[PDB]
Design a protein around this motif. Sequence first.
Motif, mmCIF file in Angstrom:
data_model
loop_
_atom_site.group_PDB
_atom_site.id
_atom_site.type_symbol
_atom_site.label_atom_id
_atom_site.label_comp_id
_atom_site.label_asym_id
_atom_site.label_seq_id
_atom_site.Cartn_x
_atom_site.Cartn_y
_atom_site.Cartn_z
ATOM 1 N N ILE A 285 80.076 -42.712 78.576
ATOM 2 C CA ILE A 285 80.019 -44.012 77.935
ATOM 3 C C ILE A 285 80.098 -45.089 79.015
ATOM 4 N N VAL A 286 79.085 -45.951 79.070
ATOM 5 C CA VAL A 286 78.955 -46.980 80.108
ATOM 6 C C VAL A 286 79.990 -48.123 79.817
ATOM 7 N N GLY A 287 80.679 -48.535 80.855
ATOM 8 C CA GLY A 287 81.714 -49.557 80.734
ATOM 9 C C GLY A 287 81.341 -50.943 81.266
ATOM 10 N N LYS A 288 80.280 -51.034 82.070
ATOM 11 C CA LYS A 288 79.713 -52.328 82.488
ATOM 12 C C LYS A 288 78.257 -52.155 82.878
ATOM 13 N N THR A 289 77.538 -53.263 82.887
ATOM 14 C CA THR A 289 76.094 -53.250 83.080
ATOM 15 C C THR A 289 75.731 -52.382 84.271
ATOM 16 N N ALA A 290 74.871 -51.400 84.018
ATOM 17 C CA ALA A 290 74.537 -50.381 84.968
ATOM 18 C C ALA A 290 73.053 -50.483 85.300
ATOM 19 N N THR A 291 72.783 -51.037 86.469
ATOM 20 C CA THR A 291 71.427 -51.167 86.993
ATOM 21 C C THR A 291 71.443 -50.609 88.426
ATOM 22 N N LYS A 292 70.665 -49.560 88.657
ATOM 23 C CA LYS A 292 70.576 -48.943 89.995
ATOM 24 C C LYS A 292 71.919 -48.532 90.544
ATOM 25 N N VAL A 293 72.666 -47.860 89.689
ATOM 26 C CA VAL A 293 73.996 -47.409 90.020
ATOM 27 C C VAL A 293 73.904 -46.369 91.130
ATOM 28 N N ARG A 294 74.670 -46.546 92.189
ATOM 29 C CA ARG A 294 74.742 -45.503 93.238
ATOM 30 C C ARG A 294 75.563 -44.326 92.807
ATOM 31 N N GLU A 295 75.075 -43.143 93.126
ATOM 32 C CA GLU A 295 75.735 -41.950 92.651
ATOM 33 C C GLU A 295 77.266 -42.007 92.921
ATOM 34 N N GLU A 296 77.646 -42.261 94.184
ATOM 35 C CA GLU A 296 79.061 -42.250 94.616
ATOM 36 C C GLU A 296 79.965 -43.272 93.915
ATOM 37 N N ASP A 297 79.351 -44.270 93.315
ATOM 38 C CA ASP A 297 80.093 -45.321 92.605
ATOM 39 C C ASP A 297 80.013 -45.207 91.071
ATOM 40 N N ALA B 90 77.287 -35.962 85.577
ATOM 41 C CA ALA B 90 77.341 -37.278 84.896
ATOM 42 C C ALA B 90 76.955 -38.410 85.849
ATOM 43 N N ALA B 91 77.553 -38.413 87.029
ATOM 44 C CA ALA B 91 77.177 -39.360 88.092
ATOM 45 C C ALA B 91 75.717 -39.402 88.387
ATOM 46 N N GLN B 92 75.131 -38.219 88.558
ATOM 47 C CA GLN B 92 73.751 -38.133 88.875
ATOM 48 C C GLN B 92 72.838 -38.610 87.741
ATOM 49 N N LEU B 93 73.183 -38.290 86.502
ATOM 50 C CA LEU B 93 72.441 -38.779 85.328
ATOM 51 C C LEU B 93 72.454 -40.299 85.204
ATOM 52 N N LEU B 94 73.636 -40.893 85.327
ATOM 53 C CA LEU B 94 73.769 -42.349 85.299
ATOM 54 C C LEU B 94 72.962 -43.049 86.358
ATOM 55 N N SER B 95 73.033 -42.549 87.580
ATOM 56 C CA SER B 95 72.204 -43.040 88.673
ATOM 57 C C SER B 95 70.700 -42.831 88.420
ATOM 58 N N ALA B 96 70.312 -41.651 87.976
ATOM 59 C CA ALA B 96 68.923 -41.394 87.739
ATOM 60 C C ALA B 96 68.286 -42.219 86.628
ATOM 61 N N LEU B 97 69.015 -42.464 85.548
ATOM 62 C CA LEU B 97 68.473 -43.220 84.436
ATOM 63 C C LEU B 97 68.489 -44.735 84.750
ATOM 64 N N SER B 98 69.605 -45.218 85.266
ATOM 65 C CA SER B 98 69.725 -46.643 85.596
ATOM 66 C C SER B 98 68.900 -47.123 86.744
ATOM 67 N N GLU B 99 68.268 -46.213 87.463
ATOM 68 C CA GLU B 99 67.400 -46.529 88.594
ATOM 69 C C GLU B 99 66.227 -47.365 88.060
ATOM 70 N N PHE B 100 65.807 -47.128 86.805
ATOM 71 C CA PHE B 100 64.630 -47.814 86.216
ATOM 72 C C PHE B 100 64.910 -48.379 84.834
ATOM 73 N N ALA B 101 66.007 -47.943 84.181
ATOM 74 C CA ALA B 101 66.450 -48.416 82.837
ATOM 75 C C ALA B 101 67.907 -48.922 82.848
ATOM 76 N N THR B 102 68.108 -50.234 82.698
ATOM 77 C CA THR B 102 69.451 -50.769 82.706
ATOM 78 C C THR B 102 70.227 -50.309 81.491
ATOM 79 N N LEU B 103 71.486 -49.916 81.668
ATOM 80 C CA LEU B 103 72.314 -49.547 80.533
ATOM 81 C C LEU B 103 73.334 -50.656 80.342
ATOM 82 N N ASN B 104 73.612 -50.963 79.102
ATOM 83 C CA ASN B 104 74.633 -51.974 78.764
ATOM 84 C C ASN B 104 75.972 -51.328 78.471
ATOM 85 N N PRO B 105 77.075 -52.074 78.527
ATOM 86 C CA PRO B 105 78.366 -51.548 78.097
ATOM 87 C C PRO B 105 78.260 -51.015 76.686
ATOM 88 N N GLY B 106 78.729 -49.794 76.504
ATOM 89 C CA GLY B 106 78.740 -49.153 75.228
ATOM 90 C C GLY B 106 77.583 -48.205 75.002
#
Length: 421
Positions: A69-81, A153-169
Motif C-alpha cells: 500500500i503506497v503511502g506517498k506519491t510514488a514516481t520513479k521510486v528507487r528500489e533501495e528507497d 515488493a521494492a522491485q515491483l514499486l520501482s518497476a511500475l512507478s518508473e512509468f506510472a505514478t502511484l498515489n497514496p492509497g
Amino acid sequence: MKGTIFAVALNHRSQLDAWQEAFQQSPYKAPPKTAVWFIKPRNTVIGCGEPIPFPQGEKVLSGATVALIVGKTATKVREEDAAEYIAGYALANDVSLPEESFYRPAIKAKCRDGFCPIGETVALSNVDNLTIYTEINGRPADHWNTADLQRNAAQLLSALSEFATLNPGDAILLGTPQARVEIQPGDRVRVLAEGFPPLENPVVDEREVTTRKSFPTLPHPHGTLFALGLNYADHPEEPLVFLKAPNTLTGDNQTSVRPNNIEYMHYEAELVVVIGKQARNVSEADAMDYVAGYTVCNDYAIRDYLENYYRPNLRVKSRDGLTPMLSTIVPKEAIPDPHNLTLRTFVNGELRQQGTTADLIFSVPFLIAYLSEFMTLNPGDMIATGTPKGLSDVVPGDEVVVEVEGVGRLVNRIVSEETAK
Ligand SMILES: [Ca+2]
C-alpha cells in the motif's frame, strides 16, 4: 481500498516454470522481458466479510496474496528507497477464473464484481519470506511463500512507478502461484499470514447478491477507463478490452512526454462513451439509457514497448499523461447517431487521420451489453471505442489535435523527457 489496485501476473517462479515451453511459442514467441501488469477496477474491490458473487456456470479460483500500500506519491521510486513510499501491506485475494492464457488481457477472468477482497493495512517493514495461507470452510487449503516471487515488493514499486505514478492509497498485489484452489457458492474463504488480521469472505451465488456497490460521483474524468483494441473495419470474434490507470489521463492543451530513444510513438483519436447510470446485465436494446454522453481522448501508444503478455500492456497504455481527454461531456441527446460521426487527427495542422464511427466493428450498445454482462458499470466509467486507420509518429515540438464531429476538439503538445523534467 479506495485507490487504484494494480497487480502483477507471472511473478511466481512456479508459474514461470510451468509456462516455460509455452512462452517459446506463438503467440508468446519469447518469455516476458518486463513485468506483466493488470488492474483490479473499483467494482472488484471489497473489504472483509463482503461476499464474492459467484458467476453461475464458471469455475472460480481463490488467489490469496498480499499487497503493498503506497503511502506517498510514488514516481520513479528507487528500489533501495521503496520502504519510505510504502505505508504498509494488506492481505488480498485475486479472485479469478482460470488463467488459461496470458496473451490478451484477462478482463472476464479478473474484473468481475467482488473479485478483489482486500484487508487491513499493516505497518510491517517488509514481507520477505512470508507464507500466505488459504482456508476454505476453516480447513487449510493452500500455502505459498513470497520468497518464490521473481520481483519483490521494492522491485515491483520501482518497476511500475518508473512509468506510472502511484498515489497514496494505491496498491500493488505482489503476485500468485500457478497452483490455486477452487471456490464454490457457500464456501467461506479466509486469507491468513503472520503479522496480519485474517481476511475472510463468503462466496455467494450472484443471483442472491443485493444491489451493487455504488460510488460518489466526482467531476469527469472519474471512473474505470475501458479501452478497445481493433474496433474499426477500415476496410474479430469478441471485443478486445483493456483497462487504463487514471494517472495516464491529462487535460486539454497539456504536454505528453515521448520517451528517450524509441522508434515510434503514435496518437489515436477516439470517441469516448461516458456511463450515466449503474448498469448490470443490460440488453443492447436498452444500453443507451445508461449513457450520459460523449467525449474525446487521444489514446497514445509507445509501439516499442509492446509485448505479448496482457497486450497491449500497461507500459504502453498507462504512462503518465499519455491520455489527453476532454473534461466536457456532450449529452447523448445532442448526438442523434454516435455511429455516424467523423474522427480526425491533425499534427501541426496537417491532416493525418480521418475516419467515421460508421466503421465501428462493435457498436456502443453492443459494448455496453458486452461489459455489463459480466461486470457492473458505474456512473463516470468511460469507454474509449477505438481508432480508425491512419497512425503516424509524433516527436517533441509537435502539436497533435484530435477531433470528433459534434463532440469536441482536443489539443496536446509532445515534449522530450528533458523538457518535462
Ligand atoms: Ca486505442
